[model samples]
Target: DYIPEPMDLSLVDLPESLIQLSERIAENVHEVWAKARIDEGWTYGEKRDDIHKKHPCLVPYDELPEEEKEYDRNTAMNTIKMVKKLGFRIEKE
Candidate 1:
């Protein structure tokens, strides 16, 4: 198995605007994820309970643990980098 290189992107830099955008994106990503889980009858529990369709991360984005928030932020940051690699000049301030 090998991963194909799309673009070099060795030094893709995101401005403060994009950095802020990443946070928003991460929040919405969490929202969308929680919504989907909720739609599937998932609820908040102290521990994950697949048989009962419950999980601990069903809470709002702001309420998520720092580690969990950072995980979502990682996805958002990579998304911005990928867009830059794809040549989309985003500069929304």
Candidate 2:
């Protein structure tokens, strides 16, 4: 049983490499968000809209953005919900 608030990453014994990889994944997410704003003609408002659309639904880990490939295994569908809540949009392939 998993509790929603105060997530316990410590409950799982992930290897140091996995931890580093997760951090890298987070960095990539941030990078992609920034690029969307600066290079991809995406406004913060647009990203917010995208997040709203994709989040809440049980989207597959494989279906997330390429930048998220680094730590897909560590991510939950609800993480997509979080991203959406924070205002990240989806792009058509």
Candidate 3:
């Protein structure tokens, strides 16, 4: 499968308010991925179609290179998007 990027931001939108969300990954992909792996029915170490398409999700977020990290960042931001879409506020400082 293939998708095209028709926008400037490679993965997700990052407004200033969302910049320092977690200090590190803000949304904390470590915790996020573990939960998502369950909620999304993703098996740990299971081979997926994108195993070579870009990068891996089985390791620590800090270990991934910039390109590989994009997907997870997208996932994290998308979670925020979904929560907002459902009519909730992820209050920020």
**Candidate whose TM-score is highest:** 1
TM-score of 1: 0.82
Q: Write the per-residue lDDT of candidate 3 for residues 3-52, one digit (tens) a residue.
A: 98533334434465775553367337665765666465554453554443
Per-residue lDDT for 1-93 in model 1, tens only?
Answer: 999866555588888777876668899999999999999889999899989998999998889999999999977887778898887887764
Runs off by more than 4 Å, candidate 2: 1-7, 39-93
For candidate 2, the per-residue lDDT at 10 reads 38
Pairs in clash, predicted candidate 2? 47-87, 48-87, 50-89, 51-84, 51-88
Clashing pairs in 3: 22-26
Write candidate 2's Cα lDDT for 1-93 as tens digits: 987784434333333544455545655665555555545444433134564333321223345466555555356333644454555653333
Name the better of 1 and 3 by TM-score: 1
Structural similarity to truth (TM-score) of each candidate: 0.82, 0.30, 0.45
Give me the candidate number with maximum lDDT.
Answer: 1
- In terms of TM-score, which candidate is stronger, 2 or 3? 3
Q: Relative to the true structure, how large is the alpha-carbon lDDT of every model?
A: 0.85, 0.47, 0.56
lDDT value, residue 28 of candidate 1: 94
| Lowest lDDT block of 10, candidate 1 | 5-14
On a 0 to 1 TM-score scale, where does candidate 3 land against the true structure?
0.45
